[PDB]
Amino acid sequence: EIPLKYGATNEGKRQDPAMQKFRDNRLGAFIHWGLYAIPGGEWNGKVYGGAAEWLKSWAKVPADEWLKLMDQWNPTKFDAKKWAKMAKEMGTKYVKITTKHHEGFCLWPSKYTKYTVANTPYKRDILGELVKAYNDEGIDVHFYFSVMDWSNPDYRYDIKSKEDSIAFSRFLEFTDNQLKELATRYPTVKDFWFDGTWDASVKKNGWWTAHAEQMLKELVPGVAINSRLRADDKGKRHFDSNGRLMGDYESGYERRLPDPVKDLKVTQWDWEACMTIPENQWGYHKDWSLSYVKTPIEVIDRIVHAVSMGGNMVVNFGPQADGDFRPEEKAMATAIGKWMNRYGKAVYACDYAGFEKQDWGYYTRGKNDEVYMVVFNQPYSERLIVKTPKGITVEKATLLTTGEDITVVETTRNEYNVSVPKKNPGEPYVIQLKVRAAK
């Protein structure tokens, strides 16, 4: 047991109403919108295949020249009400918004820098408009914040001198000022999701990460804070040097979700996966033919997978410079919304069921102990294997959409064959189980 001043604060999962709401939401959208949407992955005639929001880095553009894109920031088609309607129709219960990305351009009129929406042709407080519009649709708003900031020369990647330590301290004050500004301007914020926190400078200032968490929690009652923010006394990130999760939930799994057999440890804490539609484009990229683009069923699979293991899932959008969404993203949102409207009782406010994974798909557990089978891979056997934990029996199976009764056959102790429906549903579908636990 290593003594730590700046390690974990929560003992197990938070169970206050704000955390329960964060968890029960389950399905979110991400918005990555900033100056990078203007070039859209192209600089000086070269299209770069790397993530579009990192174009400043790929094309080696100096800060002064990158930030002159503010002169072209004029999203004529932007309408916060339309963005919120799109999220509602998709079935998303919360939206995470890039307040400021690594480029340092702020989507709110910060009083602490000139690189903000106020100093563009458009002028308006985009962040504020979105907060209002989403909240008006009953959608929670979370703030993405990049600590790393390419626009501020006080940022340091590492601390190799007293001068660096002084400059970086000033940088951390500036960061605190922006954070407090966001928390006091937009008090309905429910979460702060940090990125750009991997550098040695931040790792050497674990105290600051703990302070930022505490500062925001005093300003915004019940706010959630992601693990990615946090480094302990030894520089260890996400989980402290004693293996304990820092912040309120684990933020990770952008590349690959937790394995449903080998990574059951994640059911012990709150967690959230965030996902791109292409392989690795968060901001707007003009050419989606450069990498694999996920289909709606592939995204739906990921969403259910997350919930089945006790986690949230957030689907990313990278709006066009004009303030509208590309057609592929409108199609995705509509497709997800259709399926969610039919089958969402197996997603919203659901959790890990504690059953052994089977090949046909995933289990999820509802708040009244409903066990939902979400079937993605239809067996030629016409039988869905259900192995129950000790003391649990399956009493009935019902097709969620129609209420039709589904045959259940016991094959051996604690194992059943659940029949597939009489008519193939032709899409991923749900069977709801009634289970009983012995005394």
Ligand SMILES: *[C@@H]1[C@@H](O)[C@H](O)[C@H](O)[C@H](C)[C@H]1NC(C)=O
């Ligand atoms: C951080 C940023 O570097 C990326 O551009 C993007 O904002 C994603 C969401 C985030 N990625 C990770 C691994 O933290």
